[PDB]
Amino acid sequence: MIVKKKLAAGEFAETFKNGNNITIIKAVGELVLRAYGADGGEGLRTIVRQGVSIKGMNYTSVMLHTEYAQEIEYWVGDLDYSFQEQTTKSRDVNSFQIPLRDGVRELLPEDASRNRASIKSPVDIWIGGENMTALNGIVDGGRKFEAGQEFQINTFGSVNYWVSDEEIRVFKEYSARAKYAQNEGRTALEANNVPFFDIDVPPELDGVPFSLKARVRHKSKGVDGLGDYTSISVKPAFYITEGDETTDTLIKYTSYGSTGSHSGYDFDDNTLDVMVTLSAGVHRVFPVETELDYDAVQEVQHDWYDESFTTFIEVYSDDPLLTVKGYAQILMERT
Ligand SMILES: [Ca+2]
């Protein structure tokens, strides 16, 4: 029978009417400093201060003497034969990479076979048990391990991690109006100060299509003194090198065109959304306005490479290969 023993201050007397576990091995638990006794016909004493395996005697009631009032509860499981032995040894090693993503997520599952994990994160990582939370980017019930720090976990239970609260990944945010640009090649766009950013396409993404997006704001009313009811046609694009940064040829990617008098309210922003398929390596991307509207030329003397009525508020991305914060290295040992 598995039975409780709690504390408070004075003597305790738990007298359950059946010593079936008399001639029996006691798996008694013990804290700090106590004294106990055996009552089964005779009144006996006992003093013991460490978890011990006891032999059999007669028992109708248990005596519980107290020196320290503030020790902790135990379960003195008395059983006919009680033997518990097993630590291992680990036979197998398995090495792999985890997908570090956003919010508190499980790093390792409960797995009775795991002995040991040696882990290295390429980013600062917070590690904890089932209590760990990160309401608002602030981790509670966790502790930090540093980027590049090798550490070990030797449990077989859940562990959790946190690295970031970002659902997707962000290339650029611009406040400057995008320039009008024809597809004149990489050298010409750079020479005329058209802002760009690079995407480093990993081997794991070599020729794999992915979504590239932008939050795009068109605003024409009163801009550079343009008439409030003048109709401006827009067609934002990414011009992307088909080879790498040192190649000149650009590919134009588009998803929508729009026409009207643009007031540029933040809630009215458009989304440029294209699939792009690129070879491994670095590709250069020029967010541009491709349409030079007749009315802009006449009224406000707009020309190629001038600032348009188009702004790339945010350029970002949602491909699972890029939304990952990178890639924890795991060596796992199991029985
Ligand atoms: Ca027009």
Q: How far is the CA of 295 from the centre of ligand 1 (A)?
A: 5
Q: How far is the CA of 259 from the centre of ligand 1 (A)?
A: 8
Q: How many CB atoms lie within 10 A of CB 150?
A: 11
Q: How far is the CA of 255 from the centre of ligand 1 (A)?
A: 20
- Identify whether the C-beta of residue 134 lies closer than 8 Å to the C-beta of residue 144: no
Closest CA to 227 of 158, 179, 299, 174: 299
Take residue 175 and report the two structure tokens written for it.
């406040």
Q: How many CB atoms lie within 10 A of CB 30?
A: 17
Q: How far is the CA of 193 from the centre of ligand 1 (A)?
A: 26
Q: How far is the CA of 235 from the centre of ligand 1 (A)?
A: 12
Residue 214 CA, distance from chain mean position = 24
Q: How far is the CA of 226 from the centre of ligand 1 (A)?
A: 11
Beta strand 159-162 pairing with 169-172: unpaired
The tally of CA atoms less than 13 A away on the side-chain side of residue 233 is 8
**Per DSSP, what are the bridge partners of residue 62?**
38
Q: How far is the CA of 294 from the centre of ligand 1 (A)?
A: 6
Q: How many CB atoms lie within 10 A of CB 201?
A: 22
Take residue 179 and report the two structure tokens written for it.
């320039």
Method: X-ray
Residue 327 CA, distance from chain mean position = 11
Sign of the alpha-carbon torsion through 53, 56, 61, 66: negative
- Identify whether the C-beta of residue 328 lies closer than 8 Å to the C-beta of residue 119: yes
Q: How far is the CA of 278 from the centre of ligand 1 (A)?
A: 34
Q: How far is the CA of 335 from the centre of ligand 1 (A)?
A: 73
Q: How far is the CA of 260 from the centre of ligand 1 (A)?
A: 8
Resolution (A): 7.0
Take residue 91 and report the two structure tokens written for it.
């036979």
DSSP label of 159:
E
Q: How far is the CA of 230 from the centre of ligand 1 (A)?
A: 7
